[PDB]
Amino acid sequence: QDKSVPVWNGFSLYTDDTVKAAAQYAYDNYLGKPYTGSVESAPANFGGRMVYRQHHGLSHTLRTMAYAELIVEEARKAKLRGETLGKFKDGRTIADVTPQELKKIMIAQAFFVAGRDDEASDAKNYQKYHEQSRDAFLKYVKDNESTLIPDVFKDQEDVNFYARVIEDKSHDWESTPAHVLINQGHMVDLVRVKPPESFLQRYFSSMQRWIGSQATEAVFGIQRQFFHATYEVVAGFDSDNKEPHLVVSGLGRYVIGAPKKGQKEGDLKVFPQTYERLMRVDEFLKLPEIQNTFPGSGKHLQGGMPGMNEMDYWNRLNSLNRARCENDVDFCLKQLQTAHDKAKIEPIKQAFQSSKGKERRQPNVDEIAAARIIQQILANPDCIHDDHVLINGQKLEQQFFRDLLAKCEMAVVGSLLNDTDIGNIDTLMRHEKDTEFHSTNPEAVPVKIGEYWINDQRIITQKKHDLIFLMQNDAWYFSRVNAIAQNRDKGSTFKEVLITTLMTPLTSKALVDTSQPPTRLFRGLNLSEEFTKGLIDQANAMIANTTERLFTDNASTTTEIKLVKETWDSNVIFEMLDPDGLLHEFSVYLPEDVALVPVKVTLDGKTQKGENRYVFTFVAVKSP
Numbered sequence: 001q002d003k004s005v006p007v008w009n010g011f012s013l014y015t016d017d018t019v020k021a022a023a024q025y026a027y028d029n030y031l032g033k034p035y036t037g038s039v040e041s042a043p044a045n046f047g048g049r050m051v052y053r054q055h056h057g058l059s060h061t062l063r064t065m066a067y068a069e070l071i072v073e074e075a076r077k078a079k080l081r082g083e084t085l086g087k088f089k090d091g092r093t094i095a096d097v098t099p100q101e102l103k104k105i106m107i108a109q110a111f112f113v114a115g116r117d118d119e120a121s122d123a124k125n126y127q128k129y130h131e132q133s134r135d136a137f138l139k140y141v142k143d144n145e146s147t148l149i150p151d152v153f154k155d156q157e158d159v160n161f162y163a164r165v166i167e168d169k170s171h172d173w174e175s176t177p178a179h180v181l182i183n184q185g186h187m188v189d190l191v192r193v194k195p196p197e198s199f200l201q202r203y204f205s206s207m208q209r210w211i212g213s214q215a216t217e218a219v220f221g222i223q224r225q226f227f228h229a230t231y232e233v234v235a236g237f238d239s240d241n242k243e244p245h246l247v248v249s250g251l252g253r254y255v256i257g258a259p260k261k262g263q264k265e266g267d268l269k270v271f272p273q274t275y276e277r278l279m280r281v282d283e284f285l286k287l288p289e290i291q292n293t294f295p296g297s298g299k300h301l302q303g304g305m306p307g308m309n310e311m312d313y314w315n316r317l318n319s320l321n322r323a324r325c326e327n328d329v330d331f332c333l334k335q336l337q338t339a340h341d342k343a344k345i346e347p348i349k350q351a352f353q354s355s356k357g358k359e360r361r362q363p364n365v366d367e368i369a370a371a372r373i374i375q376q377i378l379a380n381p382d383c384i385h386d387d388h389v390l391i392n393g394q395k396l397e398q399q400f401f402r403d404l405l406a407k408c409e410m411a412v413v414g415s416l417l418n419d420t421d422i423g424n425i426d427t428l429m430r431h432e433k434d435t436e437f438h439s440t441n442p443e444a445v446p447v448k449i450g451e452y453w454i455n456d457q458r459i460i461t462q463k464k465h466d467l468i469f470l471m472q473n474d475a476w477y478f479s480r481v482n483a484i485a486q487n488r489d490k491g492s493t494f495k496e497v498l499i500t501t502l503m504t505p506l507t508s509k510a511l512v513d514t515s516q517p518p519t520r521l522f523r524g525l526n527l528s529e530e531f532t533k534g535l536i537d538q539a540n541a542m543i544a545n546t547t548e549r550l551f552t553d554n555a556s557t558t559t560e561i562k563l564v565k566e567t568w569d570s571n572v573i574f575e576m577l578d579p580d581g582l583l584h585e586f587s588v589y590l591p592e593d594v595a596l597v598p599v600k601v602t603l604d605g606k607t608q609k610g611e612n613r614y615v616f617t618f619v620a621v622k623s624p
Helices: 017-029 058-081 099-109 123-143 156-167 177-192 196-229 281-286 310-317 320-327 329-351 365-379 398-407 410-415 419-431 449-456 461-472 475-485 494-514 529-544 561-567
Strands: 044-046 049-051 389-391 394-396 520-525 572-577 594-604 613-622
Touching: 017 058, 017 099, 017 123, 017 329, 044 320, 049 320, 058 099, 058 177, 058 196, 058 320, 058 329, 058 529, 099 123, 099 156, 099 177, 123 156, 156 177, 177 196, 196 281, 196 329, 320 329, 329 594, 329 613, 365 389, 365 398, 365 410, 365 419, 365 494, 398 475, 398 494, 410 494, 419 449, 419 461, 419 494, 461 475, 461 494, 475 494, 520 561, 529 594, 529 613, 572 594
Parallel strands: 572 613
Antiparallel strands: 044 049, 389 394, 520 572, 594 613
């Protein structure tokens, strides 16, 4: 209809085993094998590990497939927003593509560049290489037709059609979702290596013809994330760049003329000039036909990773993770899956005004000093003596540590302490083995803290828990500890006061670190088709009005899926995602200013009752 799209059946690049197996067969036999040609065919090296096809490799192929999924999601979102989309000759748009088609498209995509022998750019070798890619695709489907021809494909005609797409011969083009999606997914992955403003502009326009401005901005903003995730160079964008504007369609140029205005819309190639210069980029972006159609005209985008400098970025691109993306199907698919799922949630957070955060006062100078001293004594217990601890030229007596407890909030002292101090507790106890520790009970037998500790502690986070144990149980210990924090009138071993001051903050840190809801929950519902269709419409309308921006702008819940799907046989599952911890069998409670925002709607037709079940995914966000 005008804005009606069928529900998605849960097919995804990252979850489908058939697409995964296709990608694997392509890596085990074509990609990842050394180029047999001679043009830029030498294997690169990242973090010591080899990558034989840095361009047109596994990462590139998986990225094109991710792009296909992304385009279809955003085009359906656009059609739901009401926007009009570009139509094939069928009259259909991208939003009318079915998962049965996207799956075949991805299987084909996996082999698009599998037939390459090097990175030659001539037309003859392009034709040869894509013929070989076609041959590889047909090899795969013929060797596995018992599992593919009836289920994922239909007959040999369908297979031959997608093979014709891969061959990409001019006289075989057809305005179909396969041709267009494969073409766009392959071309848009060249943003890594290019006058990046010119290329971004032409690609953005080519795709805006199909899915619109919103969807296009979303696709590219999320492509930046796919690059980050696969450890690839994310390009920049400078609307004030003064270098010559390149006319991608023809590798031409615009001469500005000498008059100020350019020629009669024409572009030049290898044209000598009369000092007459080449048009620069910013001049091209300022144009009326550009600044009034292309977003980003007048805006800029930074270079690489925001939260790091040049050198950390370098070490991130030349890491072993780059070689793992290009060499392991599972690893790269998981990187892209994580990033694509996070891209569905971050726009929502960025949208609503973030809930005012908690305010904490910064540590006092005395507390900083206390933390440093405690850290030092834990790192080198040699300075510990009978009636004092002498470190860096000062002798610290008992009254000093007592004044420390009096002046400092030992919780915010513990905050300044790290896990290395926890680890150094063992060294302290190894130095203070024979040290006797009394109790507030006069008739009690002294205890050797060091001995008991190092005896119990053998082969860690457990170390914190045991540290809590000693404080919760063992009266002989917490009696003295609590009685030192507040003033007591008992036989004060200097080491008693010392170990008190050292353990108190570390124990507080242990409590803080151990006290830290579930990430994913499931609500079961048995709804009638009326309600469920209403919910689909409302959700679809909510998810459609939230896009990644590049330039512009009750208790019936569980955690076991077999419980809501098989035991309960629910017609409707609310999948609630709580990765920021805002939600309080099991129970659930939604605070006043914590809401669930729909993110996705899925269809599983297998309720034993006989009807379809719908999975409404959600995320919890705090904002009034």
